[PDB]
């Protein structure tokens, strides 16, 4: 129960326009930051037994794996080179806190237990934590109201109002899979969750839990969920999970068997024998049909959220959101682009806006226009026989 790690983020200046009010808000943020900096400086400018204890502690302390603690002052430790020694335990160590497998600390020369180092989290899993917070609030997601509602009910309401569920003896969904075509808000709705959540967010990509050696992928998955459970509440976002989790066929190769083994370790973590803490999982997928049923099972993935290509009103929302910060001209009616019944993702709409801005800049004009938007729409979109029906 170390506690939530959160992600420090500065306030948001409501007026996106360049005006004095924005200047005042930013100046207030800056002046508070300056006061904090000077306070730290003044603390350190106005500022024995433990020092000698640390001197007695080895200078280049080594890290070794405790194994089969014995007696009350003698334990067997490992040197991380396979060798193991019947070392002694100084009084400095906590005791009643050493457990087998714990990465204790050893004096370099005499090899005596002198520390416990209960923070031996692998770098591969420490990197995949979220310390910043992307500035994609839910107000940057045009439409997707139902999807936002589902994910809020899954990963936000259980933390902000944990009385509704206890009031009817219901466990909220622990798993969500966001599936859809290539670019519809699947990753925005994880960015927004990270931005607006007080829980430890853990980015991951399915193609990252796979490791070169044997038994390392499952070990990494176990470590990832162990840290996600130590820090609680926590959310684990596995983007593009079809990297690992595809159908479990009868393998003939060895790498494929190892990948499936990693997938089974993930399945056991999601819903295994023992239990699961307050760790909530959000997977993302382009092609859900190819995923294994055991993974899509509605005990590991309680909610499945489709992100279809936006309809007309959602498309209008996307254009509004992505042209808000643009000096749109009064000649532009963002309806001609909406009406055309062509596959337009939110990514396609943003690319359309960017290309319209670039067309204006090419024409030497800083204010976009309708012809610019038409040209951008034509030149951004890259990609049944006639008369066969009707």
């Amino acid at each position: 129960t170390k506690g939530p790690d959160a992600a420090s983020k500065l306030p948001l200046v409501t007026p996106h326009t360049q005006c004095r009010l924005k200047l005042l808000k930013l100046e207030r943020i800056k002046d508070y930051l300056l006061m904090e900096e000077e306070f730290i400086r003044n603390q350190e400018q106005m500022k024995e037994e433990r020092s000698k204890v640390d001197d007695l502690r080895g200078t280049p302390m080594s890290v070794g794996t405790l194994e089969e603690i014995i007696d009350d002052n003698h334990a067997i430790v490992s040197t991380s080179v396979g060798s193991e020694h019947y070392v002694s335990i100084l009084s400095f160590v906590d005791k009643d806190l050493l457990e087998p497998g714990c990465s204790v600390l050893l004096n370099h020369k005499v090899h005596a237990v002198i520390g416990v180092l209960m923070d031996d989290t692998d770098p591969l899993v420490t990197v995949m934590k979220v310390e910043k917070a992307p500035q994609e609030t839910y107000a940057d997601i045009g439409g997707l109201d139902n999807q936002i509602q589902e994910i809020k009910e899954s990963v936000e309401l259980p933390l902000t109002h944990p009385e509704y569920y206890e009031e009817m003896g219901i466990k909220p969904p622990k798993g969500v899979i966001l599936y859809g075509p290539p670019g519809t808000g699947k990753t925005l709705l994880a960015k927004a969750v990270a931005n607006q959540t007080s829980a430890t967010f853990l980015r991951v990509v399915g193609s990252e839990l796979i490791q070169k050696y044997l038994g390392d992928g499952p070990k990494l998955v176990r470590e990832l969920f162990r840290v996600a459970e130590e820090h609680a509440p926590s959310i684990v976002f596995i983007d593009e999970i079809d990297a690992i989790g595809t159908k479990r066929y009868d393998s003939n190769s060895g790498g494929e068997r190892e990948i499936q083994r990693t997938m089974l370790e993930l399945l056991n973590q999601l819903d295994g024998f023992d239990s699961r803490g307050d760790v909530k999982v959000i997977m993302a997928t382009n092609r859900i049909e190819t995923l294994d049923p055991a993974l899509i099972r509605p005990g590991r993935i309680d909610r499945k959220i489709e992100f279809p290509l936006p309809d007309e009103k959602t498309k209008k929302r996307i254009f509004q959101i992505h042209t808000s910060r643009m000096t749109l001209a009064d000649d532009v009616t963002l309806d001609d682009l909406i009406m055309a019944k062509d596959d337009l993702s939110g990514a396609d709409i943003k690319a359309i806006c960017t290309e319209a801005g670039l067309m204006a800049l090419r024409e030497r004009r800083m204010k976009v226009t309708n012809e610019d938007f038409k040209k951008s729409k034509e030149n951004v979109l890259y990609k049944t026989p006639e008369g066969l029906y009707l």
């Binding site: 326009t17 200047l23 904090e36 499952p218 176990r222 393998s251 060895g254 056991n268 005990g299 800083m366």
Partner: protein, 405 residues
């Protein structure tokens, strides 16, 4: 017909359409970012808990505990006493990962309590023995065992009556009532493979077994048995079965054993023969040239068709049990179990809901109940009603049959 922006174009587009506050805003934002960096730099780095005890529990002069009793004895296994040559023992030691040696005792007040393979302690410079040690316990396998009983009983497993009865027989009756089996002269099966579609009560039944049994229960982490260092997985399974034999009555629970070994066909799997080797050692332990003792095995798997026939053979997996999709009565019972704790109306037709959910698993039904509660919540209502349950069924089971009227 598209000019390229010149020096003047860029020098005017940055200076002509411009707010009189744009420069100040940009500078202030940059200052905020730099100040954030500097603040993080100054107060950065916490104090990683090193394990120090609260003061007044320490004992200085432990520098004397470091200078005396200094010997950081390595651990060695006496593999051959060289016959003891009567006198002049000249023991042999097998310091693992380091070397073999021919050594003697030193201040060993009991030169007789040395034995072979007793895991003696040996100095660094002169390798004389100093103190024996108890046998190795392999902490991974030590924690593989289940200590705290999960809070699942044989009453939250609805829709599985025959399977529960078979599992109860094989896993409990030989343990708590051997009299009937010995009377009838039947040796009960030692080994069960629970298989079925993903989510039917396999691991739930394993949890219920763990709760009910009064005997060693060992949940085997399928990932802990795969490692580098070829032979390590086989060694771990060997030690696991050794500890199981040590225990008076043991119940191993290989879960998702599709991880540890399917078909043995290698072809291009030359790099995946280590998993096959540990699976072969598991097979040998399950049934080979040796009695296995009072060890009963559970093996859960969704896909019992990738498994090795040598492992599925009914000398190792003797009581294969199938967790099929529950029938209507089972589905109604699962609804009742899962909605017992829910705040629902007093006239919901769970038989109707079981009818509405065909070819649906117990996990599916749990999801239906959860979504019914969620729909009630999404309307500020405290009591989930039949309408909410029907909406949940529609949302979970499915997500036009006008030819099937």
């Amino acid at each position: 017909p598209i000019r390229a922006l010149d020096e003047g174009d860029i020098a005017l587009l940055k200076t002509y359409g411009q707010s009189t506050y744009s420069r100040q805003i940009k500078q202030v934002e940059d200052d905020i970012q730099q100040l954030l960096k500097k603040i993080n730099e100054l107060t950065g780095i916490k104090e990683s808990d090193t394990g120090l005890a609260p003061p007044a529990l320490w004992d200085l002069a432990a520098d004397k505990q470091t200078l005396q009793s200094e010997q950081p004895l390595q651990v060695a296994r006496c593999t051959k006493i060289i016959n003891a040559d009567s006198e002049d023992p000249k023991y042999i030691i097998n310091v693992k990962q380091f070397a073999k040696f021919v050594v003697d005792l030193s201040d060993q007040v009991a030169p007789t309590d040395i034995e072979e393979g007793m895991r003696v302690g040996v100095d660094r410079n002169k390798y004389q023995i100093h103190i024996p040690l108890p046998p190795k316990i392999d902490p991974t396998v030590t924690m593989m065992q289940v200590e705290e009983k999960p809070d699942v009983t044989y009453s939250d497993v609805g829709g599985c009556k025959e399977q529960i009865e078979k599992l109860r027989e094989v896993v409990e009756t030989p343990l708590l009532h051997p009299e009937r089996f010995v009377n009838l002269g039947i040796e009960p099966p030692k080994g069960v493979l629970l298989f079925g579609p993903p989510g039917t009560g396999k691991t739930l039944c394993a949890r219920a077994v763990a709760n009910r049994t009064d005997a060693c229960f060992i949940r085997v982490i399928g990932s802990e048995l795969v490692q580098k260092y070829v032979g390590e997985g086989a060694r771990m399974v060997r030690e696991l079965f050794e500890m199981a034999r040590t225990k008076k009555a043991c119940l191993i629970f290989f879960d998702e054993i599709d991880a540890i070994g399917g078909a043995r066909f290698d072809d291009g799997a030359g790099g995946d023969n280590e998993v096959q080797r540990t699976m072969l050692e598991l097979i040998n332990q399950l049934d080979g040239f040796d009695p296995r003792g009072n060890i009963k095995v559970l093996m859960a798997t969704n896909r019992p068709d990738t498994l090795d026939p040598a492992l599925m053979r009914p000398g190792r997996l003797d009581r294969k049990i199938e967790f099929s999709l529950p029938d209507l009565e089972g589905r109604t019972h699962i609804f009742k179990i899962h909605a017992r704790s829910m705040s629902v109306e007093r006239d919901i037709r769970f038989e109707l809901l079981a009818r509405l959910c065909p070819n649906s698993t117990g996990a599916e039904i749990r999801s239906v109940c959860t979504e019914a509660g969620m729909f009630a919540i999404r309307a500020r209502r405290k009591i989930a009603t039949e309408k909410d349950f029907l909406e949940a069924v529609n949302k979970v089971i499915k997500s036009r049959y006008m030819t099937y009227n």
